Design a protein around this ligand. Structure first.
Ligand SMILES: OC[C@H]1O[C@@H](O)[C@H](O)[C@@H](O)[C@@H]1O
Length: 306
């Protein structure tokens, strides 16, 4: 009868799981990525109500039987975002437990199934979050696409375009990104790229998708592309080093896992990241995520219930 809702409000999509209290996932629903930092409050509210009422429609149950709802989304570390999100859910008539957290917290829960450890996210954006044996948490990075996101897919895509333009205008080393980016975007000229970036309403996810071009060019032997991937791995490592140092974990065993397409898909980048960690923090044990972030939100929600 009773159930919990876990929502991963990620940059790739919005992903909901509804689960019984025995962790049997009854259904999962996908919507478009929608975040109050990049959409209006009205746009996000509509997605949240639609998502929740939809799943409750297929499940054939009311909000009264929902024991807890956990939502993890980018930017939800700020209490300003927290209250706005809780209000949207309260406005549906939900009267139970609501837990609003940053996306890294649900990724850590789903990845490790414990409170302690470190998560690195590199998808559209990037962040590192961890919690030590003292129960104390810390984060590094996560400052968004203008003043942060180092080593993210968005950052890789911007750097790829900059390298392609420097190749074209002779400020930088020649790279096959110069033509490969235009081919990928179905564009004819270097000027079509300007209108695409500055006028077309391109999304963060679309720019981050150029990471696929960087990976393909690296496999073709492109040196500029290899260097972009290595430096992204270095930025992700720096985010771990920061959290490890802040939490006094430099000489302790730590379990670390990784989420997002950049870090988890690209063999060279993942290998470089692991090499940096193995050399500098040999007691960090790197593992794959045991479950996805939506299931992490289910764990956080259900763990607050009897
Ligand atoms: O998705 C990883 C990170 O992306 C950044 O752009 C956001 O500011 C963070 O809140 C988020 O944790």
């Amino acid at each position: 009868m009773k159930y919990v809702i876990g929502i991963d409000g990620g940059g790739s999509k919005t992903h909901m799981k509804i689960s019984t209290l025995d962790y049997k996932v009854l259904l999962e629903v996908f919507k478009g990525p929608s975040n109050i930092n990049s959409s209006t409050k009205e746009e996000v509210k509509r997605v949240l109500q639609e998502l929740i009422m939809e799943g409750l429609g297929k499940l054939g149950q009311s909000l009264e039987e929902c024991s807890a709802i956990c939502i993890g989304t980018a930017g939800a570390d700020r209490t300003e975002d927290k209250s706005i999100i809780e209000d949207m859910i309260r406005s549906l008539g939900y009267m139970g437990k609501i837990i609003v957290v940053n996306d890294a917290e649900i990724a850590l829960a789903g990845g490790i199934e414990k409170r302690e450890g470190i998560i690195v996210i590199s998808g559209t954006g990037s962040i590192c979050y961890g919690r030590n044996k003292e129960g104390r948490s810390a984060r590094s990075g996560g400052w968004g696409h203008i003043i942060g996101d180092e080593g993210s897919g968005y950052d890789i895509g911007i750097k790829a375009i900059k390298a392609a333009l420097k190749s074209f205008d002779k400020r930088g080393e020649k790279t096959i990104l110069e033509g490969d980016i235009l081919d990928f975007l179905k564009l004819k000229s270097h000027e079509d790229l300007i209108n695409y970036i500055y006028r077309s309403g391109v999304t963060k996810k679309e720019i981050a998708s150029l990471t696929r071009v960087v990976n393909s060019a690296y496999i073709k032997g492109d040196l500029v592309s290899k260097r972009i991937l290595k430096e992204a791995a270095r930025e992700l490592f720096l985010s771990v080093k920061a959290v490890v140092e802040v939490l006094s974990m430099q000489n302790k065993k730590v379990v670390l896992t990784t989420a997002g397409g950049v870090i988890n898909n690209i063999n060279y980048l993942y290998d470089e990241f692991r090499k940096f960690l193995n050399l500098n923090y040999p007691k960090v044990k790197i593992i794959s995520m045991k479950n996805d972030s939506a299931f992490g939100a289910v764990i956080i929600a259900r763990s607050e219930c009897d």
